[PDB]
Amino acid sequence: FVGLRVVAKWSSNGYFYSGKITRDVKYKLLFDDGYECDVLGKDILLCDPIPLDTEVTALSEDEYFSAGVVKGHRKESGELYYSIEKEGQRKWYKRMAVILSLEQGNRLREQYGLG
Amino acid sequence: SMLIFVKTLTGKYIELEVEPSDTIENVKAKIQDKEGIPPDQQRLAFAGKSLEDGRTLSDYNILKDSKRHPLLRLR
């Protein structure tokens, strides 16, 4: 799974954050936030991009994270932007501004969970 | 309780549970507890506003409803 993009959490009740598998050891993860970390495969979702209609948490321009739904994807300069709708309004977010709550990630484990 | 996020200068995100009655000092202590950064070296800001010692989060109108989780940044 090395080189693969992933969303993964590093604490028992934490959020899932986007990153890359750098080595299999547990898996050595480089999060897009720059933190490097060995996390259980149990806590890794191998989906990239996060699919359409997934409920995510996204950082708005006003510096609040809040829930929304993925409605689209755009890959420009290699960077991925998500179109995310919140109460009917769509904006574009950088990959590193889109995370999953524990419940939001839990809903993807059966289909995308590593293992 | 209410959820907030803190972004370190390393770029790493931290998650904290807080009460609107929490002071900036309490928050920095939680950051210390989770990351090992001294209170004295933490310059917390929200949306570019410096958060000053001995105020609460509610003093800065940071905390809205439970659905919205503010991102504080260290500078």
Place of tokens 């570019």: B48
3-state helix, strand, coil in chain A (%, to 5): 15, 50, 35
List CB contacts (< 8 A) between B13 and chain A.
15, 17, 33, 99
Question: For residues A59 and A108, what is the distance between their CA atoms, to the nearest angstrom?
Answer: 20
For residue A18, the one-letter residue type is S
Asked, for residue A50, whether it belongs to a domain, the answer is no
Chain B nearest C-alpha distance from A45 (Å):
18
**CATH entry, B2-74, from 2.30.40.10, 3.20.20.10, 3.10.20.90, 3.40.640.10:** 3.10.20.90
User: Is A113 at the interface with chain B, CB within 8 A?
Assistant: no
Residue-range definition of the domain harbouring residue A10:
5-45
Question: For chain A, how many residues are written?
Answer: 115
Q: What CATH number is associated with residue A69?
A: 2.30.30.30
Distance between CA atoms of residues A73 and A80, nearest Å: 7
List chain B domain ranges: 2-74
B59 touches chain A (CB under 8 A): no
Q: In units of Å, what resolution does this entry have?
A: 1.8
A37 and A71 within one domain: no
Give yes or no for a contact between B70 and B15, defined as CB atoms under 8 angstroms apart: no
Residue B75 at interface with chain A, using a CB cutoff of 8 Å: no
Nearest to B37 by CA among B48, B26, B45, B29: B29
**Which DSSP string do the residues of A83-114 spell out, in sequence order?**
EEEETTEEEEEEGGGEEB-HHHHHTTHHHHB-
Domain total in chain A: 2
Whether chain B has a CB inside 8 Å of the CB on A4: the answer is no
Choose among B25, B66, B73, B62: nearest CA to A66: B66
How distant is the Cα of A34 from the closest Cα of chain B, in angstroms? 6
CATH number at residue A14: 2.30.30.140
- Looking at residue A113, what DSSP letter applies? B
